[PDB]
């Protein structure tokens with residue numbers, strides 16, 4: 001044991017706690033100046049004592065050497081697409097189809113309702129708590145290595161916030177750029193002759209495709225986790241909301257506007273409440289993503305492969 | 319010009335006409351003995367005058383040398399999957415979802431209704447009328463070269479029945495084995511010590527995976543074309559039924575039980591009529607495949623990629 005290895009560990013633990021509070025809780029216990037005082041106190045010391053520097057330290061978010069092309073990554077568990085509804089009557093028909101397709105319909109049919117961010121789908125792996133690999137969605141089967149670019153996102157933890165993290169946990173989420181960040185960026189490109197971005201979706205996509213993390217660092221990107229992929233060494237809850245609540249408690253950013261709605265009548269109330277809030281969110285939203293909250297019912301219903309909406313195989317019973 | 323090149327052309331034209339009548343029309347103009355008389359009259363002569371032998375002659379269906387492993391084939395146009403319904407109430411919900419999803423709902427909503435064969439999905443290419451390539455469905459993106467095995471199917475034309483065939487036409491269909499053929503096959507395996515087949519679906523799959531066409535030739539397989547892929551040099555009709563009627567007129571086998579039904583009430587009548595006929599068809603059927611007959615409405619509705627049945631992105635209007 002030494003006083004400096006004790007100081008480094010203390011600073012790291014504090015700075016991660018301050019980052020959880022600022023980014024995930026939206027409730028920092030200290031001013032930004034305090035957070036920064038300790039940030040460069042740590043950074044200075046790691047450089048004065050290189051032997052005690054760790055790859056997941058809050059000061060090592062940015063890789064100094066720019067990359068020379070992205071590498072392909074075959075996703076273990078596939079990244080699926082989403083079905084879409086464009087009306088109250090169309091949404092109610094999708095529910096009635098599930099109501100019959102199920103073996104037993106519970107009296108309250110609970111749904112985890114969330115806003116649909118206009119963002120880029122990614123998959124982030126965490127091995128024994130620390131971030132080792134990040135990748136784009138791509139076609140769903142294959143994507144690209146955006147690890148050094150995901151590492152630069154201030155609200156993405158480099159280390160999960162738990163003493164017993166799982167063996168391997170894949171966090172699935174959408175990268176996006178909020179309005180303030182988007183407006184600040186286009187002023188800078190205008191003040192320093194360079195291309196401006198059309199809308200926040202394109203700025204985020206363009207920032208993620210950068211091969212120099214130092215550019216990405218300057219881009220004001222943000223993550224919001226929507227699901228889970230690989231889950232080794234853990235017993236994930238039996239509802240989607242609770243799995244989301246669980247990610248929030250281990251250090252991952254999740255959208256605060258997520259709610260549970262019992263049946264289509266309540267779900268339509270949520271869709272309407274978010275449609276009026278569109279004007280005061282601080283980020284873009286295409287709509288609402290609605291999901292069957294019970295995971296057993298999700299595994300009962302299942303998926304549907306690339307297939308027409310104009311054809312159906314109405315099968316016979318035994 | 320010579321009398322023998324004139325004889326060969328005449329025999330080929332006649333034998334193809336007799337095959338259309340026997341296999342596609344189910345109405346042969348002559349007895350099987352007449353068809354066979356001419357078959358080996360042609361075969362004998364092609365062998366007495368090898369120089370005038372063609373690769374698409376009715377006598378060259380079977381390749382004499384067995385293959386040494388199948389080659390992979392990347393499908394140009396993808397081969398999609400099918401959605402499924404398990405009840406009257408579930409089917410009506412799928413219709414109501416289409417009724418709203420469309421911009422304009424026609425008064426009569428016509429559907430091309432057909433029986434669902436329990437068969438193996440294939441893709442057959444015809445270049446300037448003659449059969450050049452056949453392939454399995456596989457994952458949808460990639461399949462296997464079963465050209466020499468498809469060539470052996472008595473009801474699959476080696477040459478389209480038209481003086482102006484299209485540039486490239488991909489016929490999409492299901493290979494299956496009828497009951498008589500299936501019962502005759504298992505008696506032969508029992509009488510000559512070999513594995514029997516569980517049901518017609520497995521016998522057909524096992525026959526298609528043979529690398530020696532001579533085995534496939536002996537297996538009593540059959541094709542029924544359900545759709546079209548590549549379509550160069552032709553203006554395909556604006557309805558699914560008419561495209562099917564068109565395949566029937568150029569020499570391809572299509573199921574005779576296919577009918578047009580106006581609206582869900584009539585479609586349910588068809589589903590019921592086929593459910594009672596199950597007992598007297600002479601081949602297996604899992605159910606009924608129902609399709610929106612108008613091709614414009616098909617291109618309006620579109621497809622849906624690998625995606626959950628338990629989730630939906632209810633988007634906002636402009």
Ligand SMILES: Cc1ccc(Cn2cc(C(N)=O)ccc2=O)c(C)c1
Nearest residue numbers: 018019022028030031032035036154
């Ligand atoms: C100078 C400076 C330092 C830090 C921040 C934001 N911030 C604050 C905290 C905090 N308050 O605990 C934690 C992480 C973080 O990213 C800004 C905007 C500017």
Ligand SMILES: Cc1ccc(Cn2cc(C(N)=O)ccc2=O)c(C)c1
Nearest residue numbers: 336337340346348349350353354472
């Ligand atoms: C001996 C023999 C010859 C032909 C057939 C069946 N058949 C008949 C015709 C025909 N009638 O025009 C055309 C093609 C064909 O496949 C069988 C069952 C047995």
Ligand SMILES: COc1ccc(O)c2nc(C)c(C)nc12
Nearest residue numbers: 080081082121174226227289629
């Ligand atoms: C970018 O795509 C999405 C966004 C938000 C979601 O909740 C998603 N939920 C699921 C299940 C899937 C496949 N995609 C999602």
Ligand SMILES: COc1ccc(O)c2nc(C)c(C)nc12
Nearest residue numbers: 311398399400439492544545607
């Ligand atoms: C073996 O799969 C099928 C069988 C019958 C059909 O009509 C099909 N119709 C379509 C459009 C598709 C994608 N698959 C089909």
